[PDB]
Each structure stands twice: as C-alpha cells, then as structure tokens.
Write a protein that binds this ligand. Structure first.
Ligand SMILES: [Hg+2]
Ligand SMILES: [Hg+2]
Ligand SMILES: [Hg+2]
Ligand SMILES: [Hg+2]
Ligand SMILES: [Hg+2]
Ligand SMILES: [Hg+2]
Length: 1182
C-alpha cells in the first residue's frame, strides 16, 4: 500500500506492460543457469570422446566414427544451444528494458505534473515553512530517484530469479543430494563469505565515518583571507590538524582499508575455499558415485547463484531508496493539504463595489506561538476612500493588509468585503478584485508586455498601452530600447526599482480591482522617483477604495483617514489634524520623524611524472601486483588441469590428481591472494595516505602564497577551495594507485595469458582475442551512449525545472494567482517534448542492453564450437579448450579491474590536473629584499603618481585613471570620494595587493612598485568597515601574529589600552583569555573595532589606512573610537578616508577624488571656499 503501492500507482496499460516485462526478466535469469547445464552436457559427451581417445591403441576406424559422431552430433547440440538461449536473451532483454522506461516513464510524467501543481497549491504554508530552496531542489532530486527506483527494480527481479531458479533448477535437480553436496558445502562456504566479509565491510564504513570527522577538523576557516593576507599566512595550524587526523584514520581507515583489502582477501581466500570443498567433495563424489566430471555444471552453477544474490542486493537497495524518497515526501507530494485557501469553485460577489470591514479580529502568524499580532482589532473603511495605516515596530500593519487577501484566515473574529465576509467568497475572485502592490516589485524574465500580460492573460497591447501610460510607464518603456518587447535580463534585474515598481502598478492596473493595498510601495526607493511613483499611485487609487500602510508621513497627509499602529496596537483613528490635535501616536511618530569550473589542460602522463615526484618508492607493491596477476591466469590452468586430468587420463591416482589440484587451487589462490592484498594494500594504500597529506599541504601553502586577483578578484569561493583541498588530494591518490593496478592487471591477463597462448594451438587464441576486444568494446560503447542520453535529458528537463523554480521560488505570484496552472502549464508543454523523446530513449536502452547479451551467446557458442573443431580420430582438438576458458575468463578478469578499485582514473586525473595547476601558481610575494628596512625608512611619506588601474576585469576600464596625491609624515591624509570604489583601491594599492597598471608609489622613498612587500605591509595601520578576527582569544588576536612579533603581553596591553577595548579587558569574564568565542558573535562591532585598532597600534605602524572604519556604529563607540583613532594618529601618517563627511573636518589635506580623477583638495574652509563639488557634498550633508 501507500509506501509500495501508492509508490506504484497510476497505470492501466502501464501495470500490464509492467508485469509483462517482469516476466521477461524471469525467463532471462533462468537463461544464465540453463546455459550452465548445457555447458555440462556438451562437456560430458566431451569426456566420453576423450575417454575412448585415452583408450585408443585399438580400432582406429571406430575412433574416426565414434568421434565424428559426437563431434558433428554435439555440434548440432551447440547450434541449438546458442540458438535457443541467444535469440532468447536478445528478445527478452530488450523486453525487460522496455519495462524500465515505458513504466517509470509514464509513471513519473504523472508524478512530475501532480507535484508541480501540488507545490503550487500548498499555498501559504509554502512560505509558512519549507526552505523553498530546499524544495525545488527536492522536486528534481527526488522525482528522479523515484525513476531509478522503477527500472532498476526490474533489473533486480530478473537477477532475483536467475539466482533463485539457478541455485534451484540446478542446485537440486542435478545431483539428487549431490546437487546437495552442492547445496551443502557450497551454500555453507558461501555463508562464511557473506558474513565475515560483510562483517568487516560494516567495520570499514565505521572507519570511513570517523575519517570524515577528522577531515572537518582538517578544515577550519580559510576565508577572510583578505584580512589574512595583510596578516601573513597561518600555514602551520592548518597543516597541524590536517596531517594529524588524516594520518590517523589514514593508516587507520587504511587498516580497514587494508581490511577492504584484507576483505578482498576475505571473499577471495574464501573464494578458493569454495574451490576447496568445491573440487574436494566433487572429486570424492565423482570417483565413487555420479562419476561424470559433470558435477562441474552443478556446483559451478550454484556458484552463479551466489553472485546473482549479490547483484540482486544493490538493485533492491535502489528500489527501497527511491521508495523512501517519493513515498514519504510523496505524502509531501500527492497530498492536498490546502483548505487554508484553495483555488477552485466558490462564492461570487459580483455586486462589485463595497467597503472593507475588519471586525474584532485576533490573529497570530502561522508560527503557532508568536503574539497574536492582531490582538483583537476592529476597523471599517468606506468606499472610494483611501485609508492610511501608521505603524513602525512592525508586525501588524502589513499583516492586516495581508489577510485582506485571505493570505491567512483570521485567527478569530472576521472581515467583510462590500458587506459579505471575505472568507465566504471565492479566492481567485477575491485575489483578483484586490489590486496589490508591495515593496519588492518583482518582474519575471520577459518582455515588459508579457509582465503586464501576467497581470492579465488575455488583453491587447492597446490595453497595455493604455495601462502603462496610465501608470506613467509609457515614457521610459518608449525610450528604453526595443519597446514593450524589450526584455528583463534574467529576473527583475535590468532597470531601476522605480520603473520596476511602476511596471508593477501597470500590471496590477490591468487587474483593475476595487480594493488597492499599498504596502510601503513607493518606499525603499530614490526620493525623486518616490515622487513620480506616488504620483502614479495617486492617479490610480481614488477610483478605488484603498488601504495604504507607510512611513512617508508626507504622503500620509492626504489620507481620508489614518489609524494608529506600531507593532500590533490599534488606537487613534481619524483625520490628520485630528491625530495631531490628539497629540497622540500619529502626532508623536509624526514629530519623531520631524559552483562550476572544469578546465581543458589535462595532464598526459604528467601527474605520472609528477606522480612519482609525489612518491618515495614502493616497487614492492607493484611487485606483488605482478604476482596477483599471474595468480589469476594460474587459476585458469589449475582448474583446466583438474577437469582435464580427470576428464581424460589414468584411473588410479585420479584421487591424488584431484585432491592435489583441489588443494592446489585453494592454497594457491586462497593464500597467495590473501597475501597479495594484505601486502599491496599496505604499501600502496600508504602511498595514498602520504600523497594526500604532503599534498593537502603543498596545495594549501600554494594558496596562502598565491594571492593577488586570486581572491583579490575571484569566482573561486571559500567552498570551491575547501572543496579543492579535501576532494582533490583524495582523487590524486587515485591516479597513482591506478598506475599500480595497471602494471598488474596487465601482466596477469596478457603476459600470463599470452604465454599460455603459446601452448594455445592457434585456433581459439585467435578464436577469442577477437571476441574479447568486441565484447569489451561493447562494455564501453554501451555505457557511453547510456551517459549521453542521461545528460541530454538532464538538459531538456533543466529548461523545464529551471522555470518551475522561477515560479515556486517566486510565490509573489499567488498574489495574483493569474498564471497558476497557466504556469506549471507552460511547463506541461516543455515536459511534453522531453516526454515523447523519453519513450524513444526507452526503446534505445532496450536495443542496446539486449545486443550486449546477444553478444553473450554469440561469443560463447562460436567459441566452444570453433574450438571443438575437428575431433575425427583424435586430433589437436581436445582438453586445451579449458585454457581457452582461461583467456575468455582473462578478459573478464581485467573487467573486474576496470569496474573496480580506484576511481575510473578520469575524475581522479581531472582532479589531479586541477590540484596541480593550483599547486604550480606564482608566489607573487613570499620573500624579496626590495629594500632592507633601512633604519630611516620610518618617515612614512606616501607617494602616488600616475596611478592608473582596474582590478582584473579591466574591461570595465579602471577606477583609477591618472591619479596622483601624496601625504606628508606623522600626519593625516583626508579622503573624500564619490562612493564605494576608489577609496578602497587606493588603500589596497598601498597594501600593494594589486599593482597599478601605470605610474608608481613611494611609502617614503622608492617605488612601492618595488619595495619588499612583506615589509611594505610591515607598516599598515589598516582597519575597515567589517572588522573580524579568527577565533583565538582576543589576547592572541590583539597579538595578531603580524610576524615574529611575539605575544608581547604588556604590548597586547598597550593596544587594549589605546584600543580602549580594555573596558572589556578589565573585567569581562576570563578577560584577555576570552576567545572571540564562536568566531566572534558575542561583541558589538564597536568593541571589535577597538580590537582591530589594537592589532594595528600593536603593530606600531607609521602609516594608517582607516577605511571608513566606523561607518556602522553609534554614540560612545563612534566617539570614543574617534578618540582612539585620534591619539592613534598624529604620532603617525594616516589616510583616514571615509563617508563621515562630517567628522572629516579634522584633516590635514582633504582631497576630493572623483572616481579615477582628483578634482578638489586643500583645507576644509579652503575647500568650501572652492564652492562647488565638496561644497555640494557638505550642502547635501546638511
Ligand atoms: Hg530508462
Ligand atoms: Hg512578525
Ligand atoms: Hg599487489
Ligand atoms: Hg572595487
Ligand atoms: Hg585564530
Ligand atoms: Hg587619520
């Protein structure tokens, strides 16, 4: 049910095609082991012919007859075998995949649409809670996981039955208690394998989790770097914790590693154990009873069974996951909560006109406990009027303006439109009949026209034309390029909020209501526009009855009535002069107011070269690698031997021959490998450890040392970098361990196979190598195309989903709801196309998969057939075919390798290239001399000449175009610019973060072009807007490890002293010892700046960069700090730059720079004397 069933609902000819495909799956699995059996009977006839071949030494002609007999005979049998099966799979494989999509396909389509409309209907809850972000995200993420859940489930079914029926059909049928010898030994061994192996496997995971914890404590902060570049470079705290925990769980999860290893050793040691009881119990039960050399088929086949239970397991996992996902957040999906609103049938007050009536309504936000903002409120408002709501402490005004749209049903009491109660009339209708314009005016990415059209679907540009013009929009929309068809460069990002807002008004204007709510509308907008905007509002509302809430008491006046609010609290109602005449709230408040990137450079064999660089040595590992390899073909022969030396030979000793080869198979594989792993995993794994550590280090310092427009002008977020660090070291480790499983698999498969290929008598050797390359080639080609379709669909769906987020992500739609389905509808179209395309690709997956299995039979058949070729009287055609199985199984061996161990190279090589380009870099500023700190360079006179520059992005021309100023010593360079850039760039430039594109500078005596950077920054009393401190105790922060500068206590005290942060230092728990506590949050920026300043005056500079420092503070913070910055200066030169146009008066040389070019300068009154620019600045300052 629900879980599983709801999970699998929706589907007539769906459910039917489904059960059909399941069936195909069934028969298919059954194919694999039937195929086993037949391999058996062909093999038996093969023994009989080899047995009499063994006898030989007699009637030659009867050998030519007995032989061409079974030859051509089983030759017929082989034919009908590849046939029956072969054709079989092709047909049914294609069928089970047609299961996959036909099913999941339609099933999701249905899902998809229900959810789209579902979300769009959850209404005010979809704001009430839900990250919304986390939502759309889940829309796609989950929807898809459902998909995988369905077609893979099919895969399982199929295998569930090749295992079930195999282990059965043969696991019993053949042997009658011998097949049980199977059941017995076999399933039992298989038991020890499953347990022990899986035991450690869980053990492994636990190892990996503890790893993860250590890796986070391997992270810490890595941002704020600007502050940290003027700091120097942590460099050692990072390494410290890094290699600490890493090494730890390195070798540790590396024991579980060398335990995954020790695990390969498990399953495999225990694999050859299989071989043990396998052959053992076999041989005994082959010299006594059931003497066939065909126990093979049986036991061997039951083995196939185990393997299949494996594949079945991952498929099942898939199912369950997709279930959990959909099903649970499906009740989140399907489910039709709503009721807090709806958008269907209802009541219709077509009387048009009427008065609003807020009657005795209490209400608290959706968040169950906040105060009932509307704490019992009554109000009424006549028609054609326009009422002003006046509040400030938030939480009310806006809200009544809220439910006046039924946004939320009234907690208690009620409201009435016209004369009926809001709740009673239908929504779509209400919402329409209620024009509304709030602050944030949002415009979807489209033409102006289309946005107004959103206001009203059907409607002709003649009406829009009217609309705009009515909302004074007609002018700009006309001069602006393209006209109404002009767009809106992705989101409402292209024009001024002023016009945005206007456009809106137009939108709502075509909606043409009878109620109009203006939520501060005009607000948060430039003054002049505010005018124009309110202007359009005016020409809009009187026709309509309107409730407006706002702060511009200036635009309040003309209120037919006002009401007193201020954070949920109704009081004084009435006309202006009345609420002023009251000298109450109105009057009161009235007077109070007066992460993408991927790069082309690869690294052909380079990270190999550099590999070994990132390497000490471990030939040892590669050593056993070679052995592991041989180990495999070895098996090929040891087995081929058994069967051989028992399918044709001398009677006595066959027990010892058996028994021997049996144990041989065990001791050999079992041990050798257990070993192989243990060892190799030890050495090579350790290579992964180190490589990754000495790597995270290498890279990190590369960054610390790096700098300049890296973060100075990036698109390499803190994340992108923490990312790089962790993920990349890992990956690379991968590129090296890979070179290892390379020499290895290599020798094994080929080398060994080829030698034994010599003993191959050129008729199979060749017979196969042709086959393996082709079937191998399939593995590849198939997976390839499978990816193409996967990604491309991700694209089409991306168009759709991208736009479905546009909506859900923009709820400021339900506002009008005049799009709803219309919306998700446009997306119904998009889908539509990717849907038809989906049915096809369904088919595709099928044909492909199938064709692969057809290769299955083709391969085998041709093989065994050709091999057998010519056994007329006993010729070069006999047992050797078993070594043929050896080279076929060889190709399959290497297959294990590609589909196992480290990341398919790839992502690892990519990651390598990446972390390599990053580790290469250009220090740009480590050491250097460019002076020798001469014991006189203390003057501190700053020189800026020519100074032309633009932070790399130069196309936006520079913000410094031919600049030149300077600053005497022990004094104060006053900086007053336009805004933002300019003041910053200057500072920086001194800090020589970015070097001027032309011209030069002299902190005193010579090219702050070429002066030793580290020293240049030795002196820099820098303190900016947003201070900051990494979490050391403030005593340490204070002690900002500028360099060798030791934590001079009394020094840190000197700072705290003139810092005036001492006020917190005197008492405040733990005093200096108090860590910034939680990275900061526990102290006002005022105190913070006190510390920053400390830091600085602790450095005992000579020059100072006071970048608008206090430009966000208040009273005694501001002031006291100016007292700090005060005594902080005059002892040294300092460019105090700011937007404190006021307190800037105490300046030595005040320069008025106009972004790029300096236009005014001199002393204050002298500047005013120069009535003009600086003047206007002071005249606006008022
Ligand atoms: Hg599919
Ligand atoms: Hg609130
Ligand atoms: Hg090895
Ligand atoms: Hg800038
Ligand atoms: Hg710190
Ligand atoms: Hg200053």
């Amino acid at each position: 049910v629900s879980v599983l069933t709801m999970f699998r609902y929706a589907g007539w000819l769906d459910r039917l095609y489904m059960l059909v495909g399941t069936l195909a799956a069934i028969i298919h699995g059954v194919a694999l082991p039937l195929m086993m059996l037949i391999f058996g009977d062909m093999t038996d006839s093969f023994a009989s012919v080899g047995n009499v071949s063994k006898n030989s030494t007699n009637m030659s002609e009867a050998d030519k007859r007995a032989m061409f007999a079974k030859l051509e005979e089983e030759m017929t049998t082989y034919a009908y075998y590849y046939t029956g099966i072969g054709a079989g799979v092709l047909i049914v494989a294609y069928i089970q995949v047609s299961f996959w999509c036909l099913a999941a396909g339609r099933q999701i389509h249905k899902i998809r649409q229900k959810f789209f409309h579902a979300i769009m209907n959850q209404e005010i809850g979809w704001f009430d809670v839900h990250d919304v972000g986390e939502l759309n995200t889940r829309l796609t993420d989950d929807v898809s996981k459902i998909n995988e859940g369905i077609g893979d489930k099919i895969g399982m079914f199929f295998q569930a039955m090749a295992t079930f029926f195999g282990g059965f059909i043969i696991g019993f049928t053949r042997g009658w208690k011998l097949t049980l010898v199977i059941l017995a030994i076999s399933p039992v061994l298989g038991l020890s394998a499953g347990i022990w192996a899986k035991i450690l496997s869980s053990f492994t995971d636990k190892e990996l989790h503890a790893y993860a914890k250590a890796g986070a404590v391997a992270e810490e902060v890595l941002a704020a770097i600007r502050t940290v570049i003027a700091f120097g470079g942590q460099k050692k705290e990072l390494e410290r914790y890094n290699n600490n925990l890493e090494e730890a769980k390195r070798l540790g999860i590396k024991k579980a590693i060398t335990a995954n290893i020790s695990m390969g050793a498990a399953f495999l040691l225990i694999y050859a154990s299989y071989a043990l009881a396998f052959w053992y119990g076999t041989s005994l039960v082959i010299s006594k009873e059931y003497s066939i050399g065909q126990v093979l088929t049986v036991f061997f086949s039951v083995l196939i069974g185990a393997f299949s239970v494996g594949q079945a397991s991952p498929n099942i996992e898939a199912f369950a996951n997709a279930r959990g996902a959909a099903y649970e957040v499906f009740k989140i999906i399907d489910n039709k909560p709503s009721i807090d609103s709806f958008s269907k049938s209802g009541h219709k007050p077509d009387n048009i006109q009427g008065n609003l009536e807020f009657k005795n309504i209490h209400f608290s936000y959706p968040s169950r406990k906040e105060v009932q903002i509307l704490k019992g409120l009554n109000l009424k408002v006549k028609s054609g009027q326009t009422v002003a709501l006046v509040g400030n402490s938030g939480c009310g005004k806006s809200t009544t303006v809220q439910l006046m749209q039924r946004l939320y049903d009234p907690l208690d009491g009620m409201v009435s439109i016209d004369g009926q109660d809001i709740r009673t009339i239908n929504v779509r209708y209400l919402r329409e009949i209620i024009g509304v314009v709030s602050q944030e005016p949002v415009l979807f990415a489209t033409t102006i026209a289309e946005n107004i059209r959103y206001g009203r679907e059907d409607v002709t540009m003649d009406e829009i034309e009217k609309a705009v013009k009515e909302a004074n929009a007609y002018d700009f929309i006309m001069k602006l390029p393209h006209q109404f068809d002009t767009l809106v460069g992705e989101r409402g990002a292209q024009l001024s909020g002023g016009q945005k807002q206007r456009i809106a008004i137009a939108r709502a204007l075509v909606r043409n209501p009878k109620i109009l709510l203006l939520d501060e509308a005009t607000s948060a907008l430039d003054t002049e526009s505010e005018a124009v905007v309110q202007a359009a509002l005016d020409k809009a509302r009187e026709g309509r009855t309107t409730i407006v809430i706002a702060h511009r008491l200036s635009t309040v006046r003309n209120a037919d009535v006002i009401a007193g609010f201020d954070g949920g609290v109704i009081v004084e109602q009435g006309n202006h002069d009345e609420l002023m005449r009251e000298k109450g709230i109105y009057f009161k408040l009235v007077m109070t107011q007066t992460l993408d990137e991927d790069v082309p450079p690869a690294s052909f064999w380079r990270i190999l070269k550099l590999n070994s660089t990132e390497w000490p040595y471990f030939v040892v590992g590669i050593f056993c690698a070679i052995i592991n390899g041989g180990l495999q073909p070895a098996f090929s022969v040891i087995f081929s031997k058994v069967v051989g030396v028992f399918t044709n030979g001398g009677p006595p000793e066959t027990q010892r021959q058996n028994s021997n080869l049996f144990s041989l198979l065990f001791l050999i594989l079992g041990i050798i490998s257990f070993i192989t792993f243990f060892l190799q995993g030890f050495t090579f794994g350790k290579a992964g450890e180190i490589l990754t550590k000495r790597l995270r280090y290498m890279v990190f310092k590369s960054m610390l040392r790096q700098d300049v427009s890296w973060f100075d002008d990036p698109k390499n977020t803190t994340g992108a970098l923490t990312t790089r660090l962790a993920n990349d070291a890992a990956q690379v480790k991968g590129a090296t361990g890979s070179r290892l499983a390379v020499i290895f698999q290599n020798i094994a498969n080929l080398g060994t196979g080829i030698i034994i290929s010599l003993i191959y008598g050129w008729q199979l050797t060749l017979l196969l190598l042709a086959i393996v390359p082709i079937i191998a080639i399939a593995g590849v080609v198939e997976m390839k195309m499978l990816s193409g379709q996967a990604l491309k669909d991700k694209k089409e769906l991306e168009g759709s989903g991208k736009i479905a987020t546009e909506a859900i992500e923009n709820f400021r739609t339900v506002v009008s709801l005049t799009r709803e389905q219309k919306f998700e509808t446009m997306y119904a179209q998009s889908l539509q196309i990717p849907y038809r395309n989906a049915m096809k690709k369904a088919h595709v997956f099928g044909i492909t998969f199938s064709f692969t299995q057809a290769m299955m039979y083709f391969s085998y058949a041709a093989a065994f057939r050709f091999g057998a070729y010519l056994v007329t009287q006993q010729l070069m055609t006999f047992e050797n075919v078993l070594l043929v199985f050896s080279a076929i199984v060889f190709g399959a061996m290497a297959v294990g390798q590609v589909s196992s161990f480290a990341p398919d190279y790839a992502k690892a090589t990519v990651s390598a290239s990446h972390i390599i380009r990053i580790i290469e870099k250009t220090p740009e500023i480590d050491s250097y001399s460019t002076q020798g700190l001469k014991p006189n360079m203390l003057e501190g006179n700053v020189q800026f000449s020519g100074v032309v520059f633009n932070y790399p992005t130069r196309p936006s021309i520079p913000v410094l175009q031919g600049l030149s100023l300077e600053v005497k010593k022990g004094q104060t360079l006053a900086l007053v610019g336009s805004s933002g850039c300019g003041k910053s760039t200057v500072v920086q430039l001194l800090e020589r973060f970015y070097d001027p594109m032309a011209g030069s500078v002299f902190l005193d005596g010579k090219e702050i072009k070429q002066l030793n950077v580290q020293w240049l920054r030795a002196q820099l009393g820098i303190v900016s807007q947003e201070p900051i401190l990494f979490d050391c105790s403030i005593a340490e922060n204070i002690a900002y490890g500028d360099n060798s500068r030791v934590v001079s206590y009394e020094e840190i005290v000197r700072a705290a002293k003139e810092a005036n942060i001492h006020q917190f230092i005197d008492s405040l728990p733990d005093k200096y010892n108090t860590r910034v506590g939680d990275k900061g949050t526990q102290l006002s920026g005022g105190q913070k700046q006190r510390i920053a300043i400390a830091r600085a005056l602790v450095r005992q500079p000579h020059i100072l960069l006071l970048d608008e420092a206090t430009s966000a503070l208040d009273t005694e913070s501001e002031k006291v700090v100016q007292e700090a910055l005060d005594k902080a200066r005059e002892g040294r030169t300092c460019i105090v730059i700011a937007h404190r146009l006021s307190t800037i008066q105490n300046a030595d040389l005040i320069v008025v720079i106009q972004n790029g070019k300096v236009k005014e300068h001199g002393t204050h009154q002298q500047l005013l004397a120069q009535k003009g620019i600086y003047f206007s600045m002071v005249s606006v300052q008022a």
